């Protein structure tokens, strides 16, 4: 059984250097033709290939990132390290390392190369956020209005993830949509949480927001304005 | 470099259907192509290696064929765990490219979004910033287009949006879009509009308000 696992800092600041370690078990980077590669996935985006290293020590890099990447192996520790320099916000992504089989051998003779055509086992992935931001609690603002009515709370400018939002201390669940946060160009996150109700219920509505990182709890009652 | 284009980018289906996803390469990649299935929150999982070989432990309903520039993955009888995003990967040329992915989600009847526009709170305005949010609630299919207009000027580069994951009961999606402006710029205009295009809407719907109108 082959397993891989990524480790490194969850948070990194722009211009800094990011070092990611892939520790694995079940194979050796001294085994014939084996490879270990790195692939990343920005939130909501497609997979992007970064680099790979083989047991005979040949290395290859994405041409778009070549100047900022270094991949290396430590055979005796069963680890592969990928160093990315000068990171910027667009480098925020989940980073995965993965195993690549070498050709099948028969009495130590390569006879099948078809198994090298895939990365067959992947690590769970490690989430890395690139922001110059310091820990900070959200500002919470009201969002106020088939014949459904909508209202919500805009949880703005906080760092880092995550934040939790519930409605009426947990009693309101139907019609609730809490969207995934977006990382603003400022380096702070922002999210909305809304709830749809029969245009008659306008019943009271309060969003309970909690950002553990900054010890910031806020309950904000939202109503249909006009005094 | 080498381009790998997946089709379709998104696909709706129901348990029991037969689906086929295709991947085309800009130059021939021989048989060096792999298919993966990735479920939300998890790493991609290898299904097919070397264009058509079934990976060990992978269920037989998955099949891959093709070589050169055109490949296809077909799942013969879709199971609930197959609602996910699929990717193809080329390993003939460096860099070892991935396709854009194809999202497979639960099919249901077309539903237009209920649209709502929210002006910025007076509380936010006092801090100097103005957030205008637009909500597209419970729609299907997933693709939707939101266009912000301020006093008829098309907005660009000053909004961000996020979409919920498919609802497990509804099978619909919801989308939130935030337009952000300084309090000053905000004050220099009156009509804030959120224009929405979607398959379930005969023509674009616009929700708006005039700033300061009381």
């Amino acid at each position: 059984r082959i397993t891989l696992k990524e480790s490194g800092p969850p948070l990194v600041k722009p211009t800094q250097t990011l070092t990611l370690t892939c520790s694995f078990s079940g194979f050796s980077l001294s085994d014939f033709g084996v490879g270990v590669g790195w692939i990343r996935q920005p939130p909501g985006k497609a997979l992007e290939w970064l680099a790979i290293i083989y047991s005979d020590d040949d290395k290859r890099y994405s041409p778009s990132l070549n100047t900022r990447l270094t991949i290396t192996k430590d055979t005796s520790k069963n680890q592969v390290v990928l160093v990315m320099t000068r990171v910027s916000p667009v480098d925020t992504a989940t980073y995965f390392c993965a195993h690549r089989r070498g050709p099948t051998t028969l009495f130590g003779v390569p006879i099948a190369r078809g198994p090298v055509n895939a990365m067959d086992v992947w690590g769970q992935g490690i989430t890395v956020t690139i922001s110059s931001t310091s820990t900070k609690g959200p500002s919470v603002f009201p969002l106020a209005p088939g014949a459904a009515a909508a209202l919500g709370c805009l949880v703005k400018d906080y760092f880092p993830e995550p934040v939790t939002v519930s409605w009426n201390s947990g009693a309101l669940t139907s019609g609730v949509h809490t969207f995934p946060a977006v990382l603003q160009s400022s380096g702070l996150y922002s999210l909305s949480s809304v709830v749809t109700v029969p245009s008659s219920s306008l019943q009271t509505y309060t969003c309970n927001v909690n950002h553990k990182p900054s010890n910031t709890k806020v309950d904000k009652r939202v109503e249909p304005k006009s005094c | 470099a080498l381009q790998l284009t997946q089709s379709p980018s998104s696909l709706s289906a129901s348990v029991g259907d037969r689906i086929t996803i295709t991947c085309r390469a800009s130059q021939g990649v021989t048989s060096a192509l792999a298919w993966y299935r990735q479920k939300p929150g998890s790493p991609p999982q290898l299904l097919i290696y070397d264009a058509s070989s079934l990976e060990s432990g992978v269920p037989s309903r998955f099949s891959g064929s093709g070589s050169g520039t055109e490949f296809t993955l077909t799942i013969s009888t879709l199971r609930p765990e197959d609602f996910a995003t699929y990717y193809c990967q080329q390993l003939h040329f460096y860099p070892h490219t991935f396709g854009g992915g194809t999202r497979v989600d639960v099919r249901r009847t077309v539903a237009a979004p209920s649209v709502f526009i929210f002006p910025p709170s007076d509380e936010q305005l006092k801090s100097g910033t103005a957030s205008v949010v637009c909500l597209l609630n419970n729609f299907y299919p997933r693709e939707a287009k939101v266009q912000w207009k301020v006093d008829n000027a098309l907005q660009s580069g000053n909004s961000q949006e996020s979409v919920t994951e498919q609802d497990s009961k509804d099978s619909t999606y919801s989308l939130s879009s935030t337009l952000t402006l300084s309090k000053a710029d905000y004050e220099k205009h009156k009509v804030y509009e959120c224009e929405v295009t979607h398959q379930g809407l005969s023509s674009p719907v616009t929700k708006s308000f005039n700033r300061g109108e009381c």
Binding site: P103, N117 | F93
Partner: peptide, 7 residues
């Protein structure tokens, strides 16, 4: 260029 196992 070509993959490590191509040709």
């Amino acid at each position: 260029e070509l993959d490590h196992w191509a040709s």
